[PDB]
Amino acid sequence: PITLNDLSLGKPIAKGTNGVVYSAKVKYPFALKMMFNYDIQENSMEILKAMYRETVPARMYYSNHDLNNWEIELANRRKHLPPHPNIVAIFSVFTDLYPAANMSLFLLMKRYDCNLQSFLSTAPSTRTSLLLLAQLLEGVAHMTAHGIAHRDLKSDNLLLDTSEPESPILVISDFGCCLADKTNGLSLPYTSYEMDKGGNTALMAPEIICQKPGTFSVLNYSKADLWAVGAIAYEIFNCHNPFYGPSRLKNFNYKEGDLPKLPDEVPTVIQALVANLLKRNPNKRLDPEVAANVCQLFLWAPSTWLKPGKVPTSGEILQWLLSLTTKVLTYPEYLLISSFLCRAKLANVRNALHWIQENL
Amino acid sequence: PITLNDLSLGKPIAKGTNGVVYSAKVKYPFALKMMFNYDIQENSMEILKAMYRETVPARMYYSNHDLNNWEIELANRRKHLPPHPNIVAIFSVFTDLYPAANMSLFLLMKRYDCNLQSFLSTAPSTRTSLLLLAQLLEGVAHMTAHGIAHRDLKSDNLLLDTSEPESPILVISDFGCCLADKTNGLSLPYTSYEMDKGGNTALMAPEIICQKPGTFSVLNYSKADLWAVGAIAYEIFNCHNPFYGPSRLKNFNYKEGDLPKLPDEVPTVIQALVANLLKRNPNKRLDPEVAANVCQLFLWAPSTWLKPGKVPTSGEILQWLLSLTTKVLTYPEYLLISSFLCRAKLANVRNALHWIQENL
Numbered sequence: 001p002i003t004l005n006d007l008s009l010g011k012p013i014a015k016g017t018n019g020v021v022y023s024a025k026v027k028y029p030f031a032l033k034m035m036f037n038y039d040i041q042e043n044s045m046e047i048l049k050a051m052y053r054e055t056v057p058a059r060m061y062y063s064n065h066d067l068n069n070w071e072i073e074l075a076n077r078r079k080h081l082p083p084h085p086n087i088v089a090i091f092s093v094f095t096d097l098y099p100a101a102n103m104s105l106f107l108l109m110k111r112y113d114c115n116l117q118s119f120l121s122t123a124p125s126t127r128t129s130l131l132l133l134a135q136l137l138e139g140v141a142h143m144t145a146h147g148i149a150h151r152d153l154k155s156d157n158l159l160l161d162t163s164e165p166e167s168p169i170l171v172i173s174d175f176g177c178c179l180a181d182k183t184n185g186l187s188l189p190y191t192s193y194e195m196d197k198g199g200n201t202a203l204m205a206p207e208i209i210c211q212k213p214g215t216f217s218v219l220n221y222s223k224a225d226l227w228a229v230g231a232i233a234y235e236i237f238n239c240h241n242p243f244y245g246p247s248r249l250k251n252f253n254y255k256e257g258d259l260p261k262l263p264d265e266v267p268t269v270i271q272a273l274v275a276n277l278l279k280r281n282p283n284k285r286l287d288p289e290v291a292a293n294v295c296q297l298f299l300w301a302p303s304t305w306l307k308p309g310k311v312p313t314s315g316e317i318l319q320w321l322l323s324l325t326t327k328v329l330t331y332p333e334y335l336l337i338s339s340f341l342c343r344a345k346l347a348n349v350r351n352a353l354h355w356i357q358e359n360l
Numbered sequence: 361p362i363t364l365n366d367l368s369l370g371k372p373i374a375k376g377t378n379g380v381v382y383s384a385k386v387k388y389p390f391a392l393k394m395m396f397n398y399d400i401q402e403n404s405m406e407i408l409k410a411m412y413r414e415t416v417p418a419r420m421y422y423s424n425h426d427l428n429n430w431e432i433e434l435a436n437r438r439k440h441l442p443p444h445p446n447i448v449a450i451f452s453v454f455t456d457l458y459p460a461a462n463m464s465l466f467l468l469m470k471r472y473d474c475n476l477q478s479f480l481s482t483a484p485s486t487r488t489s490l491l492l493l494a495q496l497l498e499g500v501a502h503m504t505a506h507g508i509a510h511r512d513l514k515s516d517n518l519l520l521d522t523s524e525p526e527s528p529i530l531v532i533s534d535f536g537c538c539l540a541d542k543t544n545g546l547s548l549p550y551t552s553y554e555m556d557k558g559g560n561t562a563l564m565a566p567e568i569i570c571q572k573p574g575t576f577s578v579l580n581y582s583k584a585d586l587w588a589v590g591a592i593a594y595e596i597f598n599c600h601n602p603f604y605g606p607s608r609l610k611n612f613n614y615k616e617g618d619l620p621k622l623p624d625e626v627p628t629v630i631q632a633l634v635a636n637l638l639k640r641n642p643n644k645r646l647d648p649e650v651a652a653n654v655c656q657l658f659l660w661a662p663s664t665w666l667k668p669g670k671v672p673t674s675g676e677i678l679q680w681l682l683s684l685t686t687k688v689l690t691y692p693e694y695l696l697i698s699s700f701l702c703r704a705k706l707a708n709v710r711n712a713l714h715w716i717q718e719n720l
């Protein structure tokens with residue numbers, strides 16, 4: 001595992017009361033995030049959990065000292081997020097003092113070029129926007145499959161690699177608010193109103209913000225990131241996020257008629273996907289595994305699958321999936337497709353086909 | 361309108377603390393149900409609303425006295441259910457004193473021979489059972505089309521006319537629990553837990569029993585009767601209602617795998633329909649208009665439509681609809697077909713066709 005001794009620091013990228021991030025390299029394409037006071041004596045458990053949660057996507061953990069019991073209980077109660085192209089790359093996590101130039105938590109990460117709101121300061125291609133949406137969906141699908149909910153998706157913390165600026169790579173980052181517990185998965189008992197519910201923010205899904213507490217009384221997060229994706233899809237197609245600004249829709253109030261119509265430039269099927277994701281009732285929203293497939297099929301299916309027409313056969317689908325694997329053996333296009341083939345189960349690709357047919 | 365003076369009573373059919381039903385005739389094929397204490401001074405609104413709701417299917421209202429304001433509010437807030445062969449026939453409703461031998465509500469109805477649970481004490485034909493399911497579906501489609509939910513469908517109150525015992529006429533009865541408000545249709549704000557939710561009983565649909573209260577927080581009944589129809593379909597094909605008995609599935613828990621398999625005697629397409637109706641997620645359930653079409657198609661379509669094959673044409677569907685209208689110009693058979701033709705829209709008959717094809 002990589003520790004401080006193996007790497008050389010540069011300029012600060014960010015400076016704060018709670019921590020610092022430094023540019024870094026091995027012997028400046030890495031960032032070393034340092035969060036201070038990772039100590040049960042200098043902070044309470046809610047703050048420490050939030051620091052550890054940031055670590056959920058990490059590839060390796062390394063520890064100098066003998067683990068305190070809270071550290072052990074944290075580690076053993078946590079769901080791990082395996083690597084994925086659309087999830088932030090955290091190469092090492094380690095605990096260490098404020099020498100080596102406060103017990104501090106350290107995260108060595110890839111440095112990304114900008115966030116999504118900066119990249120969208122100039123309008124991108126309509127093709128670029130679809131690749132962005134597909135990537136986001138593909139990330140959420142990966143989280144949900146592994147019983148993790150981000151709870152704080154937003155333009156600000158989606159990060160991009162802008163080599164080939166016509167098609168960037170998107171990654172979900174900043175897992176500080178995430179739900180990642182082995183015990184309860186995506187269902188979370190909500191007994192007191194003074195409880196961590198994720199980012200208490202604009203893009204909390206209606207089924208979370210509107211739920212009153214009780215005795216199970218459960219919060220169900222299994223389609224909650226998806227709602228946020230819907231809001232963010234607006235930004236991705238050059239509109240205001242309906243739920244941001246001074247004259248502003250609110251997650252708890254909004255009725256589905258209040259949502260702005262998307263520009264005509266954005267395909268009709270995709271308009272519908274966005275309208276699906278933004279449904280108030282999570283039971284009316286697609287599964288993530290299906291919603292990610294809708295975007296992938298739009299992108300790569302035979303055109304006959306997309307026009308009304310249409311004979312669809314279990315054997316023909318498999319043949320098509322195998323045609324795709326060969327096609328990947330334009331780096332974003334490769335990543336998305338391999339991302340899609342990794343999780344493709346035949347049931348869910350038909351479901352997605354059936355959904356596209358019913359929306360024209 | 362028919363009032364007491366026009367009819368002659370016979371034996372009691374039922375006696376209770378809350379009211380009486382008498383056999384009756386005009387000058388004994390009618391029943392005159394009398395409910396006592398239809399007076400705000402003798403009963404609370406909850407009980408009166410329940411009494412009035414029993415009147416939702418009624419053909420004529422007649423009132424001796426100047427309506428009280430609570431009566432006025434009841435009437436103006438209520439959706440009316442038009443006549444329909446599979447909805448109980450209530451020819452007149454009138455308010456009257458307990459002389460004429462307590463203000464009492466009176467309902468003059470058709471007398472039916474038995475309820476569904478009695479008729480099924482002997483196993484009927486497999487064909488008879490399909491006729492029963494088709495009529496029940498056709499009732500629920502009629503209610504849902506007019507924004508009414510029964511909320512208390514069960515074997516005990518589905519009533520039959522058993523002339524021609526090979527094919528009986530089924531009617532939905534006992535509208536005391538029903539939702540029929542002009543204001544809110546089938547979407548009911550659910551703000552306190554001590555709220556009237558329909559019969560708080562075994563065949564409440566999962567989406568109703570599982571919903572917690574809040575601030576909109578709505579209860580959606582638009583597919584709830586249909587859930588109950590699924591459970592009842594088991595009884596209609598000689599099995600135990602999965603949700604009745606001592607070792608018993610519950611509406612809030614049951615996983616879709618827990619459901620007993622239906623007998624091999626009951627067609628494969630129909631086993632699927634029952635499985636659809638019993639899906640926990642009301643979005644994954646067919647529209648009532650479509651589900652009723654599935655049964656009708658199974659009964660009367662050209663056999664080419666049902667086997668895998670299969671060219672289905674908008675013009676050809678219309679031709680087949682017109683062939684049916686001529687075919688009805690075996691009284692249950694006539695009733696079902698005319699019931700199907702009255703509501704047949706070209707869109708929904710194709711949806712149903714397409715659904716049948718995908719389940720084989």
Ligand SMILES: [Mg+2]
Nearest residue numbers: 174175176177
């Ligand atoms: Mg944070």
Ligand SMILES: [Mg+2]
Nearest residue numbers: 410534536537
């Ligand atoms: Mg009653």
